[PDB]
């Protein structure tokens, strides 16, 4: 019975498809979609951008630019919200919930999808850097004749701040999308499906620095992300005001390398982080 119950799921209801499809949309694995959804929302920034006429329609405009999807799976992407923002920070709360039907709802728990929304709002927040930072890299391009010490010494800050974001992202693109997906894909091949899924996502939120155990490691990330946003505000009338900002950035980054090292004695997942943040330096 059990062997005929599990087999009924794969060869008839495509359980193997739903997993490898929700990852294409929620965990932002499929490019040209997050790079098109986040890119649209970030173009605006209150009363706007909150009614179901723009955010409930920006998705139906996003899926067309995906070049992957537009299937019965591709629907049921309710791009809803869970808070009404009043008014430089690094927060924009917004959910993205999948939807299923009866014979599949009994396996994919209504609590597991809720944790995707936990790991999603982080991953979207990351895109806010690689776009805003891309803006100042593009905003400075039109400034070019104007070659002096004040100019070249300024641009070296961006290359010094961008590399830190392009390495913490490269970490996320290795743990939460590839190795945690190696398991739970060669692991599957009826009760086990509930626990195996409860172990796939749980490793994705554990290696994702969202667990309260390693929370102090996450608190420091905001200090980094905040200073890059301030760096975007000052798009040389106020050079020194920016020179102080970068010096605060080099201090906090130098503090992260110590707080992660002290947290090695007490987690093999964090081990790969120090090898990422540190390479031919101290």
């Amino acid at each position: 019975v059990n062997k005929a119950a599990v087999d009924y799921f794969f060869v008839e209801l495509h359980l193997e498809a739903h997993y490898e499809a929700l990852r294409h949309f929620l965990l932002m694995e499929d490019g040209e979609f997050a790079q098109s959804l986040s890119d649209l929302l970030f173009e605006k920034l209150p009363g706007e951008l909150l009614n179901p006429l723009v955010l409930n329609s920006v998705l139906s405009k996003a899926l067309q630019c995906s070049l992957h999807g537009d299937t019965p799976h591709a629907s049921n992407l309710s791009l809803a919200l869970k808070y009404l923002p009043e008014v430089p920070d690094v927060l924009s709360c917004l959910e993205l919930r999948y939807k299923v039907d009866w014979p599949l709802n009994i396996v994919i728990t209504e609590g597991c999808v809720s944790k995707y929304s936990g790991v999603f709002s982080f991953l979207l927040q990351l895109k806010l850097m690689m776009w805003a930072l891309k803006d100042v890299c593009f905003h400075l391009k039109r400034t070019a004749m104007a070659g002096s010490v004040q100019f070249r010494q300024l641009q070296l800050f961006k290359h010094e701040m961008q590399h830190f974001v392009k390495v913490i992202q490269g970490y996320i693109a290795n743990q939460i999308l590839h190795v945690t997906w190696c398991e739970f894909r060669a692991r599957l091949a009826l009760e086990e499906i509930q626990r195996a899924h409860a172990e796939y996502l749980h490793k994705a939120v554990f290696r994702g620095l969202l667990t309260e155990k390693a929370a102090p490691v996450m608190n420091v990330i905001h200090s980094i992300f905040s200073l890059v946003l301030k760096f975007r505000s000052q798009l040389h009338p106020n050079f020194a005001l920016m020179q102080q900002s970068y010096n605060t950035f080099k201090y906090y980054s130098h503090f992260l390398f110590k707080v992660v090292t002290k947290l090695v004695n007490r987690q093999p997942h964090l081990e790969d982080f120090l090898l990422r943040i540190n390479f031919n330096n101290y």
Partner: peptide, 15 residues
């Protein structure tokens, strides 16, 4: 391999 001494320089890989 040897990298720059001033800024933290790393190596990146994607699949």
């Amino acid at each position: 391999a040897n990298f720059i001494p001033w800024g933290p320089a790393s190596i990146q890989v994607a699949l």
